[PDB]
């Protein structure tokens, strides 16, 4: 899951640790092998650092307690439903879907049938 | 058993890791490597999680309480009984028996010693 | 991709080996490591074999050797099967057949008796 | 595939090396690791061997070498056997013999005498 | 072990885990890796499960109380008894010695002194 | 750079394998181990696959295919747009957009209908 | 994270081990696999050294209480927004932005919009 | 195989390697890895070597190289020594000598006098 | 180890767990990566199995109380006193020197020389 | 070498394939496992594209490919700027300004007026 | 930190075992995966021995309380000084910078500025 | 260590494990992978076994308080001293040093500066 | 092999290298993981070298160079320091000398006068 | 081989890949893992880079470039500096000086000013 902790950089999560410790903080580095930097993170005993380096060989598992919207899963979903017509825009974190449907984190831009399946996928995705 | 648990995706499932927790939730994906995120889980204490992301370093085992019925083990089955014959159908997730026999979740539509062999087959595949 | 090709069997595949060899048949086996057993295979000097049994190190990569379904025709056969009700969406090569049920080249979308019989359109274009 | 090759021990393979070599020979013995030794194997320039040790790493891949019995030549035995018993049905390419005996190009369904019967005239089509 | 575990396919074995925990239940799929699939299992707890999936890396043991004739088992040992005769055939469930004599699980079918030296060699077997 | 792919998901990138084939085509997946999926992928001797499952010990390299926006070229259209609000600022190959919105070849920064019309003609551009 | 520690060389460190040990000191020396050597360290036991040898097998996270400025890290997210104009510049520890522009540990040194620009993000950078 | 090859210590084999030499001598060690020391060892450019230490990674496969006793010429022989007690079985290939000795091409069944004799002519046609 | 664990195939030895579980049975099967399958084993709970199947990662170390002669060993030492002149064949478990001496696990027969340094030598090693 | 190439990030550089390829530019990324991102950069044929992905399991070598700056020049150029206070030392090849700047082909040493003064003139001859 | 270690053999050091034990000895030996022997070595409990040999999976941590003066690492400061014109001589352990300047751990040798940078360099490495 | 390891094959040494056993007997066998043999060992609970077969993975470190001469040693050490001029010699345990000095355990034979240097040599390396 | 390896420090060897080099030359040093560290030692070029260190990975196989000791010759010049007290034995290839000194082609066994003689005879021909 | 290599730091080293490349440069890094770093290195094609940054399963073997120090010019030359105390010793290849001063052609034993003086004329030895 490179790609979803990706998806968290800047927001705050929980990295328990198999020494007992669980930090938490803002997630700031994730590379391919999971190793994990956190900003400004604290441990239960309350002691507090700019920066925690985690080596990935002692993460147990990583919490995150915020949905956070994220479009290229989103793509991924659409996918599925309109086969070989999707793509996403990393420029603008915006999905399309053929040339006249654009679904942004706010919601679907389009009309017609496409625009109405893909407003009903999103709102899927959205729960 | 990467196979295996990609049938539960969307499912409840309980994962106990080597540190002693214990986590409930949905399964959200599963990779190769068999790292597992779960979404809307909980641990035993109570607390609750919108995604959490094992490291399958240590994840011990995942249980299932559920029954989920799965065509490509049901295709898989049916290619011992009825050897070069079989074909799962990812599109209409359905499995083809010969020419005139199919095989969905809810049963076996078709007639003749075929039709009949599949249907003993599919009885006992739901165990 | 062991779900993705998992999602395949009985379909056929080529497997392309790094000695240069590539063999077509029918995907019979994939396990976690990526060994993959084929079932009526041949190679390109037209050996036939019951069973290939693939080493993982030696796989450069799996191909589709089926093309997607021609959404065009499907409609021109559908619209003979439910008079009025079928149109072809040009924007997204997709066919809707009613208010309710929705065929895209990877499957159909959809419950009912429209849908069922769909998928018995599908899966008879699928042969 | 250890399982599946673990059950064609004493079964003819043929197994592809990546420095160009083909043996071809009895699998013998296979590992967890899918190291596999054949027994009587010879290789493409015809030199025989009795034993075979071949290591995992340079194996490419391991194919059989029988083709699967003709199931109407097996039915056209069969009936010999059991005459008027017997129904060879196109649709899957199986064997009936009575009631409780099926035949697949991979094997024999059924118990009793019948069943044990039809086994061994499968076993002989292996042995040719 | 692989090769053994799979002769105890459908059987119920223990599998006792480096956490401490010991499931027994039908060993339902075994792999290259030893991954386990355990199903109707239960713990020591009490709890049970319809499919257990247990990673490899946390299996200490696996155990059987009971005796299960593997034919394959028999074809390894005639091997050196009857050297360069023997042949064991999957489509059977049979162990074939040179051209006329044939053991299956419940015995020695044959005449003369091959059919005599495997008859002794089946009863060794048998504990 | 599992994350970098990832982002290029639906756009159509090269990838040079270690036998000498090169497929092009739609990213599909990718996993961490960097195993790749392509979609409607073709080599270079022309057969086309609608999907291609390329393991990760063989993938040489992976390359975009797509060449950047021609910035000049989008400074003249957004201009056609967006009248006497239009500044190609060569220093950083960057136009920007009245005060609030900034456009670079790989992004438009801002908020509001300024920033929202940016992003659609650059999308415009994406698509061709 | 071996490029973020090499930052960190010469400056005061705390690494936890898994013995549940924890040394605090300078940072000397960290190569690509994450062993660690540090000057001068104690553990919490009171004990100091001239140097200990840290092997990563062992190591659980490496934690910093310091803001330490990285130009590096700078020259990354600068090349986000002025993409194909940034140059880091290790000779003097400086990134450039075009020709005119250049930014120190101190500050944007330039005029205009992209000097500007360049101001506003090493502001955010400082945070 | 360790434990196959480590009953052929003494015994000729060949060993292939990855880079085309193949090296035949007397096996002189075997590790867990699979690291084979050969004694006396040539290469097929006739090269000799008192020993060649052959790292498991280059290793394609080790094969035997002494062909299995002719059992109708060891039973023809065995005749002499005793005579009218003898019989070679087709069947299997075998050589039964009296009734509580038995002689397969890779060993000796029994214990006593007749087996112990029996042992050193099938020696004896080992070292031809 | 793999090849002195095969000697003791059928002997009855002793398998202790990194978890603390001890397991005493007949060694049934030995592989190269070292897992273990016992036959009619039992632990120190005195709970008793027809099949334990010991992965190698748990295996701390596998005991014997039983001396067992291995003819390939006395052929390693043979091939010391006796360079280029020793052969073990697994047909009869006997070990060749020069083509005149034979060793079986009860004993050296030949005469002459090299029989009484082969006699010393298996004395010694048994 | 992980520190010394993240130091390099915007420098021009060469990475060597094992399939025999070479591309040339822009090094974009370096992480631990040493995979390399490449932005602009070209192939011997003379193909380019704004990004490569370069899996480290196939590079050979990363050679630096800008030459180092000619201190004889430098101090040339910089006597213009610091009349009579510019020194150039043969024995080292280092550059003398003043008596507390010093300058050599990796960096500028000193600190005040002078020094930030000969730090822009150094990275002048790194610009073009 | 195979190369700093080197530097300290038949220097006293000791290693912190993850069994929890201490040794305290001379470093007779280090190779390439940091297995370590210990020449008349002792532990907490007061047992003494001739050689401990240690399996480098069960190393913590090894430290030594001795300022030893290596320079290999002079050479590698030095070089970043007057890159180009170093030189570490093993032969004399001794480092040449350009060609009237040399180095040994006793000081700098030779005169003009080179000597001069080099003696500041040289008292700064000794800190 | 596997070849100091191997000087010691014979003689007594103790194995230390990480599941807190120690075995004390004769050093039998040793391999690459440092798996060991000891012959006649018995464990601090007094319990005796003709065979230990140790996993190398459980082995913290093998202890020895035996000073035991080897041969192979003083080469490398004389190689420093004599570079180009010596030579291990196996079949009889001795240390050539040129053509007219050769050391056994029992010291060196030879007359002239190169003995006297080589006798030095020796009583060192006995202590 | 370390162990076999590490017991001819100081002795010639050759070492094939998968790249198709074969170096040869002292055997300096050995590790655990078989890199090996050889002293004065050339190519087939002719090219020599005061050291060359080889990584593990390429390394195909190490092969003695030394031919084992001519006993018959041994025996020979052994009869003109000890006598009418030499007994080559053709059964073994051995040297007997006295009855309390046995010479073979890897040592020297007996202690005493004759013995330590019978090793510096057997060093002589090591070092011609 | 780390620590030795290590040791050769700021020499000149042959590195041989296994893409057939040979680069020959200054020792500029090691690391545990054997990747390499030269400095000012040049390949068989005459191509040479400031830095070079080899991926240590590339690397074939590592060689000394420079020849040994001719130890009986060393002595001829130790004479005009120390008349009448020079000795060289064919036996071991070895100069003496004084009778507490040892030199090798590794390097100098002995302490004090004549081991100094020693030190220094074995540097202009090895220097060009
Ligand atoms: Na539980
Ligand atoms: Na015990």
């Keep these: ?11 705050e999560v929980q ?10 903080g803002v997630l700031h580095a994730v590379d391919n092998q999971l190793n994990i930097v956190l900003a400004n993170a ?11 380096f985690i080596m990935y060989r002692y993460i147990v598992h990583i919490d995150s307690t915020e ?3 994220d479009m290229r899963e989103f793509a991924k979903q659409a996918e599925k439903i309109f086969p070989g017509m999707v793509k996403y825009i990393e420029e ?3 999905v399309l879907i053929g040339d ?15 625009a109405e399946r893909a407003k009903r996928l999103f709102e899927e995705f959205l729960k």
Tied chains: 1, 2, 3, 5, 7, 11, 12.
Excluded: D, M
């Design 67 to 69: 949905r956070r919207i």
């Design 42 to 52: 604290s441990n239960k005993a309350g002691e507090k650092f700019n920066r925690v």
């Design 92 to 94: 603008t974190n915006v």
């Design 100 to 114: 006249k449907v654009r679904v942004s984190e706010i919601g679907v831009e389009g009309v017609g049938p496409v």
């Design 1 to 11: 899951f490179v790609a979803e902790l990706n998806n968290l950089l800047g927001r």
């Design 15 to 24: 990295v328990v640790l198999s020494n007992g410790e669980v930090y938490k």
